[PDB]
Write a protein that binds this ligand. Sequence first.
Ligand code: HEM
Ligand SMILES: *[C@@H]1O[C@H](CO)[C@@H](O)[C@H](O)[C@H]1NC(C)=O
Ligand SMILES: *[C@@H]1O[C@H](CO)[C@@H](O)[C@H](O)[C@H]1NC(C)=O
Ligand SMILES: *[C@@H]1O[C@H](CO)[C@@H](O)[C@H](O)[C@H]1NC(C)=O
Ligand SMILES: [Mg+2]
Length: 326
Amino acid sequence: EPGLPPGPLENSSAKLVNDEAHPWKPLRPGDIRGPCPGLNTLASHGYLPRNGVATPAQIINAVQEGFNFDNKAAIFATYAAHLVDGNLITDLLSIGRKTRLTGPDPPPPASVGGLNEHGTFEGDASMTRGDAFFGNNHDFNETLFEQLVDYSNRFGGGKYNLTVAGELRFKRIQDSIATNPNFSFVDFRFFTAYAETTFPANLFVDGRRDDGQLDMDAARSFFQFSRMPDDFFRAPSPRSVTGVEVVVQAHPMQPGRNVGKINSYTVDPTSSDFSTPCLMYEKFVNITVKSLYPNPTVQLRKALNTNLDFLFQGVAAGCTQVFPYG
Ligand code: HEM
Ligand SMILES: *[C@@H]1O[C@H](CO)[C@@H](O)[C@H](O)[C@H]1NC(C)=O
Ligand SMILES: *[C@@H]1O[C@H](CO)[C@@H](O)[C@H](O)[C@H]1NC(C)=O
Ligand SMILES: *[C@@H]1O[C@H](CO)[C@@H](O)[C@H](O)[C@H]1NC(C)=O
Ligand SMILES: [Mg+2]
């Protein structure tokens, strides 16, 4: 029942993706949008179902076709999200809030909470979304976006680029340390927090230019309105995180968390970091996934095993597959 992960694009050239077949349309009542401007934009152009509920294969196809996200990155991100936020029996994932549209729920402690669920995939120090502690981890936030604009003005000549990314990533960390007593910055989120800052430079820049300089009109169009610029061409080749090394080198951090009070950031030696990427995969499967499904029945175990094989297809060569359910 779970479809096979799509393979890479047969033709990965730049092309018009804001085309007649994929027009932007406003949200209808019930349409779900969430913390990811990429998926949101794909849904609002009909690369994904416009109500924001999709299969993993639909998501992989959409991120490749609409933005030229590369295949391994698409597979890893999509199956990680599906394993912790999606319905494994119906093969459906919400790109935002929890919804009955993903079908009958599995037993607790699984939450099938969509991408909005804090602490499974989604986490703190996002760029244009607030921390979950402050009440809303998914809607566009104007104040946070205006800080992104200010950091683009100060470090990118008015454009968002990897230098801006390195300064803003660290600012959002510092602000969470100072204000969120529950701030968590370990393991999966420690990786995605750096990766996500490269995506506007690598994937929201029109592919005919591909110069890594994102202007603020296009930025607002994607980040707030889920809308491709008029005449938007996708990137001219598959990519995801290239340049993340610049973001890390700007302000190298250790994984850690506040310990129930502000300004109490405490390094966690059990966390993976960029020196142990295989450990991040192993903890995601052995701890995060297994904690949601500690003792699955037969149909759920088979769906878990299938999606865990698919997830491993997106893991970088050199890691070893782990089997929490045999
Ligand atoms: C392949 C499947 C994808 C999944 C499952 C996914 C999921 C998510 C989630 C859950 C977040 C919230 C992260 C957090 O708060 O910890 C996020 C953030 C983000 N995603 Fe995606 N995403 C995907 C692909 C893409 C693509 C193709 C783009 C194209 C640019 C993109 C751009 C972004 C950006 C820029 C952010 C950061 C938003 C912010 O901090 O303001 N994502 N994604
Ligand atoms: C947006 O973010 C600001 C700054 O962190 C916060 O004070 C505010 O409550 C957030 N929510 C809005 C503006 O709806
Ligand atoms: C970002 O833009 C600023 C100003 O144009 C420039 O000095 C810096 O080199 C740029 N960084 C990248 C990674 O393009
Ligand atoms: C994950 O579990 C496998 C056995 O299922 C084990 O070999 C591996 O060391 C574990 N990794 C962890 C706990 O990080
Ligand atoms: Mg977040």
